[PDB]
């Protein structure tokens, strides 16, 4: 049973018009196969610019964040319809930064993802646990509660999980001084697909994509691809460098 | 003690690319004097596009929000550096929608204005109280507090107030169509300028631009402008309508 390899690029709060132009062009030129999905998430101010630079059939732009309200009195916010009007398919939801740093609740992350999913978008729905929580031993407790909020919000319409790519962020290895082992990452991915099968759809638990946003590198990734329940990567800082193309290359070979 | 009149328009989380082009060009095609400061805030997604539609030499584009950190791991967050790279001089800060709905603290809003102010942006700082607060009679107290948090962050560099525009938006007034009588609108501006001379500076107070926000509209706008301490308007709903251009004519004539 094969799921489709999927790699995301998260630029976060990085870039200028020129860097978008030069970087997007860089990735676009890299030969991208059709067995693989490649997405990059530029900052909102750069969506229009990145999209002009994308001369690629294969690659597509995503957005880092969106709101749980349609167009309205929501200053400082983007809506799904603004995204779709610009021709965007993918958006990132639940990133650790917005959850952990910016006070974004599981409900807001789940409410946000559902809304987008209703309208046909693919959501990179991001979940992960911090070191305190790993140490508590609630690795599963924390991730599943993040996931369960999505199950609850999607609810009856479980068709929507189809457009969800799970992103596991090993937040506890982000300069905690602790790095992840491919074993530890895989163990989590197995544990999550187990939840989805057991509590959503056993049939569709083999079709969902779960990617490892966990300090994946040019190396230590050829290993990570090998992990069977790891379906690809959500790169962060490295998505701003040419290392990113190489990471793409690995996914294909693996 | 003459203040240069300032009218700002907030699209809020509204717009389509096509809409943005057409409207921005309808505004640019309007005769704007060198006497009045005009600024419009489209969504971050539409910033590039709005700047391209803008053929005016007086009109400026603004941002409805900015983050309090710089470039880096703030997924879903825009930075002043991104803004200035795009050629933006104005950003909106401390809007009741984000304050009263999304949980932006007073200091969160204060640290955003300061950082954007340090890098020489002209900040549209928003203050305002809820229907309750006004009834509890806590108007000046609330407006002062939101205003104080900026003082605290600014601290020694008090001149960063020079490029501050203050928008008092009654919380009750906004959207509910119910609005502030000129007697009322003016009442608040005196207290706020009272605060500024009192707490900040007595020469700079003469020059700080306090603009009135909320349900501003034709006919009504007219007396509102005549109020000698109301230096302009922050428009939401009508900024989207051809009405906005009319509003600028009134502001100047006044």
**Alpha carbon distance B39, B58 (integer Å):** 9
Beta bridge partners of B250: none
Residue listed under structure tokens 């200053």 = A75
Residue A19: CB partners within 8 Å, gap ≥ 6? A240
Mutate which of B13, B103, B240 to test chain A, going by most A C-beta atoms within 10 A?
A: B13
CA-wise closest residue to A40 among A67, A62, A15: A62
Judge whether A85 is closer than 8 Å to chain B, CB to CB.
yes
Buried b (16+ CB within 10 A) or exposed e, A129-159: bbeebbeeeebbebbbebbebbbebbeeeee
Taking the C-alpha atoms of residue B11 and residue A74, their distance in angstroms, rounded to an integer, is: 10
Closest CA to B118 of B154, B148, B64: B154
Q: Are B95 and A76 in contact (CB under 8 A)?
A: yes
Which of A46, A75, A81 lies closest to B95 in CB terms?
A: A75
Q: What is the dihedral of CA B126, B132, B133, B139, to 10 degrees?
A: 70
- CA–CA distance, A70 with A158 (Å, rounded to integer): 22
- What does A81-117 look like in DSSP terms, one character per residue? HHHHHTT--EEEES-HIIIIIT---HHHHHHHHHHHH
Range of B107's domain?
1-254
Quick one: CA dihedral A15, A18, A20, A26, positive or negative? negative
Residue B178 and residue B84: Cα distance in Å, rounded? 37
Q: Measuring CA to CA, which residue among B210, B216, B222, B209 is closest to residue B237?
A: B216
DSSP calls for chain A = --PPPEEEEE--B---HHHHHHHHHHHHHS---SSSEEEEE--GGGHHHHHHH---SSEEEEES---SS-SBS-TT---HHHHHHTT--EEEES-HIIIIIT---HHHHHHHHHHHHHTT-EEEEEEE--HHHHHHT-HHHHHHHHHHHHHHHHTT-GGGGGGEEEEEE-GGGSSSS-PPPHHHHHHHHHHHHHHHHHHT-TTTTTT-EEEE-SS--SSSSHHHHHSTT----EESGGGGSTHHHHHHHHHHH-
Q: Is A175 left (phi over 0), alpha (psi -120 to 50) or beta?
A: left
**Is A95 assigned a catalytic role?**
yes
Question: How many angstroms separate the CA atoms of A13 and B86, rounded?
Answer: 14
| Beta bridge partners of residue B40, listed in sequence order | B9, B61
**Catalytic residue, candidates A97, A104, A153, A169:** A169
Q: What distance in Å separates the CA atoms of residue B254 and residue B222, rounded to the nearest whole number?
A: 8
Q: Rounded CA gap, B161 and B206, in Å?
A: 12
Of A85, A161, A170, A181, which is closest to residue A134 (Cα–Cα)? A170
> Residue B240, class by beta-carbon neighbours within 10 Å (0-12 exposed, 13-18 middle, 19+ buried)?
middle
CB atoms within 10 A of CB A175: 7
- Annotated catalytic, B95? yes
CA distance B211 to B233: 5
CATH number of the domain enclosing A32:
3.20.20.70
Q: Rounded distance, CA B247 to CA B10, Å?
A: 14
Tell me what percent of chain B is helix, strand and coil, each rounded to the nearest 5.
Answer: 45, 15, 35
Of residues A252, A240, A230, the one with CA closest to residue A46: A240
Please indicate whether, in this complex, the C-beta atoms of A78 and B14 are within 8 angstroms of each other: no
Distance between CA A74 and CA B187 in Å, rounded? Answer: 28
- In B, which residues are within 8 Å of A12 by CB distance? 72-75, 77
Asked if A19 and B78 count as a contact pair (C-beta separation under 8 A), the reply is no
Cα separation of A168 and A233, whole Å? 9
Resolution of the structure in the document, Å? 2.7
C-alpha B38, offset from chain centre: 11
Question: What is d(CA B173, CA B130) in angstroms, rounded to the nearest whole number?
Answer: 9
Asked if A212 and A185 touch (Cβ cutoff 8 Å), the reply is: yes
Measured CA to CA, the distance from residue A162 to residue A123 in angstroms comes to 10
Question: What is the rounded CA–CA span in Å between residue B192 and residue B104?
Answer: 21
- The two tokens of residue A2 are 């094969």
Spell out the SS3 assignment of A194-215: HHHHHHCCCCCCCCCEEEECCC
The SS3 of residue B234 is strand
- Nearest chain A Cα to B15, which residue? A82
Q: How many domains does chain A have?
A: 1
**Residue contact B75–A83, C-beta within 8 A:** no
Q: Which residues of B touch A45 (CB under 8 A)?
A: 44-45, 47-48, 78, 82-83, 86
Q: Which residues of A touch B43 (CB under 8 A)?
A: 44, 77-78, 82
Q: Name chain B contacts of A48, Cβ cutoff 8 Å.
A: 17, 45-49
State whether residue B253 is helix, strand or coil: helix
Distance in angstroms (rounded) separating the CA atoms of residues B88 and B92: 11
User: Alpha-carbon dihedral of residues B208, B9, B81, B71, nearest 10 degrees?
Assistant: 120
Check if the beta carbon of residue B222 is closer than 8 Å to that of residue B250. yes
CA atoms within 13 A on the CB side of A18: 1
Catalytic pick among B97, B104, B169, B186: B169
- The region that residue A13 occupies, defined by phi over 0 for left and psi between -120 and 50 for alpha, beta otherwise, is beta
Q: Do B75 and A65 touch (CB under 8 A)?
A: yes
- DSSP structure class, residue B108: H
β-strand partners of B10: B41
Residue A93 buriedness (CB in 10 A; 0-12 / 13-18 / 19+): buried
B19/chain A closest Cα distance in angstroms: 11
| Of A179, A168, A125, residue with least CA distance to A143 | A168
Q: How was it solved?
A: X-ray
Tokens matching residue B96: 């009741």
Cβ A195 vs Cβ A146: under 8 Å: no
Residue B75 contacts residue A98 (beta carbons within 8 Å): yes
DSSP lists the bridge partners of residue B61 as: B40
Terminal C-alpha separation, chain A: 15
Q: How far is B90 from chain A (nearest CA, A)?
A: 14
Using CA atoms, how far apart are residues B233 and B170, in angstroms rounded to an integer? 12
In the structure encoding, which two tokens stand for residue A148, read together? 């369960």
Place of tokens 């070979």: A253
Alpha carbon separation from A51 to A108, A154, B43, B63, B179 (Å, rounded): 28, 30, 17, 21, 42
């Amino acid at each position: 049973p094969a799921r489709r390899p999927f790699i995301g690029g998260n630029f976060k709060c990085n870039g200028s018009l020129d860097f978008i132009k030069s970087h997007v062009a860089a990735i676009a030129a890299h030969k991208i196969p059709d067995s693989v999905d490649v997405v990059i998430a530029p900052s909102a101010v750069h969506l229009s610019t990145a999209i002009a630079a994308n001369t690629s059939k294969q690659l597509r732009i995503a957005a880092q964040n969106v709101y749980l309200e349609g167009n309205g009195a929501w200053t400082g916010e983007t809506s799904v319809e603004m995204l779709q009007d610009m021709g965007l398919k993918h958006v990132i939801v639940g990133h650790s930064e917005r959850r952990r740093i910016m006070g974004e609740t599981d409900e807001q992350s789940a409410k946000k993802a559902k809304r987008a999913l209703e309208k046909g978008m693919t959501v990179i729905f991001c979940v992960g646990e911090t070191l305190d929580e790993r140490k508590a031993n609630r690795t599963m407790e924390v991730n599943i509660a993040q996931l369960e909020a999505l199950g609850k919000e999607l609810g009856e319409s479980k068709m929507l999980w189809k457009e969800v790519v799970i992103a596991y962020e090993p937040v506890w290895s982000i300069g905690t001084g602790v790095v992840a082992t491919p074993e530890q990452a895989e163990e989590v991915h197995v544990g999550l697909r187990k939840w989805f099968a057991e509590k959503v759809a056993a049939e569709g638990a083999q079709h969902i994509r779960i990617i490892y946003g966990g300090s994946a590198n040019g190396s230590n990734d050829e290993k990570l691809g090998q992990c069977p329940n790891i379906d690809g990567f959500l790169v962060g800082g490295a998505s701003l460098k040419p290392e990113f193309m190489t990471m793409i290359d690995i996914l294909t070979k693996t």
